[PDB]
Structures are given as structure tokens and as C-alpha cells.
Scaffold this active site. Structure first.
Site, mmCIF file in Angstrom:
data_model
loop_
_atom_site.group_PDB
_atom_site.id
_atom_site.type_symbol
_atom_site.label_atom_id
_atom_site.label_comp_id
_atom_site.label_asym_id
_atom_site.label_seq_id
_atom_site.Cartn_x
_atom_site.Cartn_y
_atom_site.Cartn_z
ATOM 1 N N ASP A 44 0.869 -1.162 0.000
ATOM 2 C CA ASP A 44 0.000 0.000 0.000
ATOM 3 C C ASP A 44 0.920 1.229 0.000
ATOM 4 O O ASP A 44 1.578 1.528 1.015
ATOM 5 C CB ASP A 44 -0.869 0.011 1.266
ATOM 6 C CG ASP A 44 -1.666 1.318 1.440
ATOM 7 O OD1 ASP A 44 -1.736 2.217 0.527
ATOM 8 O OD2 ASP A 44 -2.233 1.477 2.553
ATOM 9 N N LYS A 97 2.570 11.487 -3.723
ATOM 10 C CA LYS A 97 1.422 10.854 -4.358
ATOM 11 C C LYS A 97 0.495 11.918 -4.896
ATOM 12 O O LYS A 97 -0.281 11.657 -5.826
ATOM 13 C CB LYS A 97 0.660 9.968 -3.359
ATOM 14 C CG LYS A 97 -0.369 9.009 -4.010
ATOM 15 C CD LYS A 97 -0.802 7.990 -2.993
ATOM 16 C CE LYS A 97 -2.009 7.148 -3.437
ATOM 17 N NZ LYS A 97 -2.240 6.034 -2.438
ATOM 18 N N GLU A 146 -7.329 0.654 -4.394
ATOM 19 C CA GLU A 146 -7.358 0.530 -2.934
ATOM 20 C C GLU A 146 -8.680 -0.069 -2.383
ATOM 21 O O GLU A 146 -8.637 -0.980 -1.547
ATOM 22 C CB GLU A 146 -7.023 1.893 -2.263
ATOM 23 C CG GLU A 146 -5.521 2.216 -2.315
ATOM 24 C CD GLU A 146 -5.190 3.713 -2.257
ATOM 25 O OE1 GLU A 146 -5.999 4.506 -1.736
ATOM 26 O OE2 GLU A 146 -4.102 4.086 -2.753
ATOM 27 N N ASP A 194 -12.846 5.224 3.775
ATOM 28 C CA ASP A 194 -11.388 5.265 3.846
ATOM 29 C C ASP A 194 -10.934 6.644 4.254
ATOM 30 O O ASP A 194 -10.839 7.558 3.435
ATOM 31 C CB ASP A 194 -10.793 4.881 2.484
ATOM 32 C CG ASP A 194 -9.268 4.783 2.512
ATOM 33 O OD1 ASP A 194 -8.634 5.216 3.515
ATOM 34 O OD2 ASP A 194 -8.703 4.246 1.530
#
Ligand SMILES: Nc1ncnc2c1ncn2[C@@H]1O[C@H](COP(=O)(O)OP(=O)(O)O)[C@@H](O)[C@H]1O
Ligand SMILES: [Ca+2]
Ligand SMILES: [Cl-]
Ligand SMILES: [K+]
Ligand SMILES: [Mg+2]
Length: 379
Positions: free
Chosen positions: A7, A68, A172, A196
Site C-alpha cells: 500500500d 502521491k 485501494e 477510507d
């Protein structure tokens, strides 16, 4: 040789491996089951993970994080231009691709976002190798469901640079569903909501799973809501406390604020399992020590609006998917901020008391599912 699941997160990354019939999430050299997605450049070395995050207040111009947020984007992308205003490191234009520019080994150097992320992945690869006792060469790596081809390409490139054969790039929320074995029935639709709430971003995804096939029905959330926002509410609270105690405003001192933020994040984590936490910072400002405490109830009060704001994107996703709350079969918690008891209560209450899938540490669930998928792909 086992393949690994990784991850590669905005704020923290996590690595797991499926072997001997089970997943194990792999602790780093400090014993932490997740590692900051941070890289620091010095006069002599590159620090990655805990060692980098630990010196962020000290070396702000040469400590890179949030890569990211840049990966696979154009320099002139309005997202890039906006995020740049808030980072202490320099971003530059190289042929309409952003590069982070730092001092490193006594020279000015610039790195693509995928090169920064490759460093984070190298650390995750090494963490796995120390545990397994041999070199790892195959991995599944995860990305947000909203990532486009270029963002997926650049994430794979990061993996390749790190020395990994990237078996697959998977979403994800898909990985989180795989972790809970939600794709194992045959015909019959199963509606799953993945909630999330991470360190920097909030993603709600509704998947319909039919005979192992995943369809994304709806997505919602906020790319700038996450645990760092809760840390910040604590920071402002303690800034006020410092003013009352010392008649001094520390809020314009970047290093004191960063150090306070670090302490607040630690206290926040403690509050998920204890009802009080202590903060002890030596030489915070003008050599003055700060020792204080915070209760869980006060923390919940300080963040009440932010926690509550997570419910409306759930409402919007449900609307877009044309589903009523009652039609969701499984509610899956992802992201370290979903370990906050108040956040759990709000979500469970919204769903009228439905179970929450939280038996896998939410901050590890994505790596867990990526590890299972890597093992499936290896046969
Ligand atoms: N036990 C905990 N209680 C509350 N927040 C936590 C806990 N553990 C980690 N966090 C927070 O989770 C956030 C990171 O979530 P994670 O899912 O690991 O990363 P990312 O969002 O980058 O994928 C950070 O804000 C961290 O402080
Ligand atoms: Ca934010
Ligand atoms: Cl409540
Ligand atoms: K993560
Ligand atoms: Mg995450």
C-alpha cells in the site's frame, strides 16, 4: 519466493505477504507496521520512512512528502499549482512534469514524483526482505480508484525503479474488499461500502461484487480531509494553551509548530485506545518545555465538525449508486483515522447499527488485500 502486497499511501505505506495460508503485515526496523511516505535528503545520505519523518521539523526544505499528490500529473495541473502553496519544499517545472528540487550531497538536485515514491517502495521492499530472509522481486501495488492511466503508469514506474516486477496495479477499495474475502461468492450482487479516512485524504467507494467481478458504482469524498486535519485542531488548541500559560504565541514559529504537530499526532493515536494522553515536549519554544494532557472527550469536541463532515459523502455515494443505506451488505473501514472511536460511532450510527468490518487494522487493510492478490497472481 513470496510476492508482496504494497500500500503506497499519501502519508503512510504498508507492506504485507501472504504465505503459509495467511497474511502477515510486516513491521519495519522500529517495529512500526506502517511507515511514513517521507524521504529526506542530507549532505551525506537519503533517509526514508521513520528516519525522514523524524527530522521533518529540522530539515523542511529537503524533506519530501505528499509525492502521491504529484505523481503522474502535469506541472500546470491546477491540483499541482494549488498544493505547491502549502509545501515547504520546492517544486519546479521540467517539460510540464513537476520535479521536487532539494539540496542533496552538497548539490542542487531534482527528482520526479515517481523517483521519490520509488525510494519509499525500496524501503518497503527492504522491510519485506529483512522479514522473509531473501530478495523480493514481485509485488502488487495499490492506487486510488480515481487514478487515471498516467497516474497508474507513474506508480508502476516507481515500483520498477525500486526493482519490483509489478504484477498488477489494483484499486485501494478493491484491495480492501479482497482483504475481507468479499469476492469469493458466485452469482448474486453484494454491495460493499469502503469508508477510507487516511492521513491526508478521505475516499468513499461503493462496489458491487458479482461472481468475483468488481464494479465501481460510486465514489465520493475529499482529497484534503484526513488525520493531519485532526492533528491540526489539536495543534491550535495547544497553541492557545501555551499563550495562556506563557503569554507567548508560538504559531508563527514553523519548527515549534511542526514539533507540536508530531506530539499531537502521537497523542491522537493514544486516544484511540485510552481516554487520556500526555504530551511532553522539551524546549518547544525559546527553550520552554511543554508538558500537558488531553482527554478523548476534548479531542472529540475539537474535531466534531470534521468527523461529522465524513457522512455527507457517504450520503452522496449512496444517491449516485441508487442504493438505500439498508442495501449495503458490508461496511469496510480503511485508513488509520477510522481507528478513532468517535468516527466509528458516527458511521455505525449513520448505518443504523450495522457491523463495521474493522478486525484488520484499517491502516493495513489495503496492504493485506494487495498481499492476497499477489499470492493469487503468483498461483
Ligand atoms: N490508532 C490511531 N488512531 C487515530 N489515528 C491514527 C491511528 N493510527 C494511525 N492514525 C492516523 O492514520 C493516518 C494515516 O492513515 P494510513 O491509512 O496509515 O495512511 P494513508 O492515509 O497515507 O494511506 C495518520 O493521520 C495517522 O496519524
Ligand atoms: Ca487537509
Ligand atoms: Cl456521535
Ligand atoms: K496507507
Ligand atoms: Mg490509504
Amino acid at each position: 519466493a513470496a510476492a508482496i502486497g504494497i500500500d503506497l499511501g499519501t502519508t503512510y505505506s504498508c507492506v504485507g505477504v501472504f504465505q503459509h495460508g495467511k497474511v502477515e503485515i510486516i513491521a519495519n526496523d522500529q517495529g512500526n507496521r506502517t511507515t511514513p511516505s517521507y524521504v529526506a535528503f542530507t549532505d551525506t545520505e537519503r533517509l526514508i520512512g521513520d528516519a525522514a519523518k523524524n527530522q521533518v521539523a529540522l530539515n523542511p526544505q529537503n524533506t519530501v512528502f505528499d509525492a502521491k499528490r504529484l505523481i503522474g500529473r502535469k506541472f500546470g495541473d491546477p491540483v499541482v499549482q494549488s498544493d505547491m502553496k502549502h509545501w515547504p519544499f520546492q517544486v519546479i517545472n521540467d517539460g510540464d512534469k513537476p520535479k521536487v528540487q532539494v539540496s542533496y550531497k552538497g548539490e542542487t538536485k531534482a527528482f520526479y514524483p515517481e523517483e521519490i515514491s520509488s525510494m519509499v517502495l525500496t524501503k518497503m521492499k527492504e522491510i519485506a526482505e529483512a522479514y522473509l530472509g531473501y530478495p523480493v522481486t514481485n509485488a502488487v501495488i495499490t492506487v486510488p480508484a480515481y487514478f487515471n492511466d498516467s497516474q497508474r503508469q507513474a506508480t508502476k514506474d516507481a515500483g520498477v525503479i525500486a526493482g519490483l516486477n509489478v504484477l498488477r496495479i489494483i484499486n485501494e477499495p478493491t484491495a480492501a474488499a479482497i482483504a475481507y474475502g468479499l469476492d469469493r461468492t458466485g452469482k448474486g450482487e453484494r454491495n460493499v461500502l469502503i469508508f477510507d479516512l487516511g492521513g491526508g485524504t478521505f475516499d468513499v467507494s461503493i462496489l458491487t461484487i458479482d461472481d468475483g467481478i468488481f464494479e465501481v458504482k460510486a465514489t465520493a469524498g475529499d482529497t484534503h480531509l484526513g488525520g493531519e486535519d485532526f492533528d491540526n485542531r489539536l495543534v491550535n488548541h495547544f497553541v492557545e494553551e501555551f499563550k495562556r500559560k506563557h503569554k507567548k504565541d508560538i504559531s508563527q514559529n514553523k519548527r515549534a509548530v511542526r514539533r507540536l504537530r508530531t506530539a499531537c499526532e502521537r497523542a491522537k493515536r493514544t486516544l484511540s485506545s485510552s481516554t487520556q494522553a500526555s504530551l511532553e515536549i522539551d524546549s518547544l519554544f525559546e527553550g520552554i518545555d511543554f508538558y500537558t494532557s488531553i482527554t478523548r472527550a476534548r479531542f472529540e469536541e475539537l474535531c466534531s465538525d470534521l468527523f461529522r463532515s465524513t457522512l455527507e459523502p457517504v450520503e452522496k455515494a449512496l444517491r449516485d449508486a441508487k442504493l438505500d443505506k439498508a442495501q449495503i451488505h458490508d461496511l469496510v473501514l480503511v485508513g488509520g483515522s477510522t481507528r478513532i472511536p468517535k468516527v466509528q460511532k458516527l458511521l455505525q450510527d449513520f448505518f443504523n447499527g450495522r457491523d463495521l468490518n474493522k478486525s484488520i487494522n484499517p491502516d493495513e487493510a489495503v496492504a493485506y488485500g494487495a498481499a492476497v492478490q499477489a499470492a493469487i497472481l503468483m498461483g
